[PDB]
């Protein structure tokens, strides 16, 4: 089952909602992640070029897919097939971002 993260559009995209699969994949409870930027999932072996592409895509409210090395709460590394999309109203205003995580380590 794939993880889902919903963030606010502005102010460095704090997490406002996660599904159960997010906790199964990452080992973090909703309480531990609400109000934080998702970058706590990253660690020393995370590819900086991948992080840079995410940073530019989110700043421009452009959809992006990346395979990124993340870390469970306990520090266990996993490969995250990550898809981020802006949520827009019909006037083009960005209301939120939605992220989908798949553990593709295996």
Ligand X SMILES: Cc1cc2nc3c(=O)[nH]c(=O)nc-3n(C[C@H](O)[C@H](O)[C@H](O)COP(=O)(O)O)c2cc1C
Question: Which residues carry a binding-site annotation for FMN?
Answer: 37, 39, 42, 55, 70, 80, 101
Is 37 a binder of its own copies (CB under 8 A)?
Answer: no
Cβ within 8 Å of residue 41, ≥6 positions away: 26, 70, 71, 80
CB 1 within 8 A of CB 10: no
Q: What's the closest the beta carbon of residue 78 comes to ligand X, in angstroms?
A: 10
Which whole-number Å values give the CA distances from 70 to 61, 88, 90, in the listed order? 22, 27, 34
Q: Which of 48, 75, 91, 106 binds its own copies (CB under 8 A)?
A: 91
Q: Contact positions toward ligand X, by CB under 6 A?
A: 5, 7, 13, 37-39, 41-42, 51, 54-55, 58, 68, 70, 80, 82, 84, 97-99, 101
């Amino acid at each position: 089952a794939s993880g889902m993260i919903v963030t606010d559009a502005g102010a460095d995209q704090p997490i406002v909602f996660v599904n159960r699969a997010f906790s199964t994949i990452t080992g973090y409870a909703p309480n531990e992640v609400l109000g934080r930027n998702a970058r706590f999932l990253q660690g020393p072996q995370t590819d900086p070029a991948t992080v840079a592409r995410l940073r530019e895509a989110i700043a421009a409210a452009r959809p992006i897919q990346e395979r990124i090395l993340n870390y469970r709460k306990d520090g266990q590394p996993f490969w995250n097939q990550l898809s981020i999309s802006p949520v827009r109203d019909e006037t083009g205003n960005v209301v939120a971002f939605v992220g989908v995580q798949t553990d593709v380590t295996a």
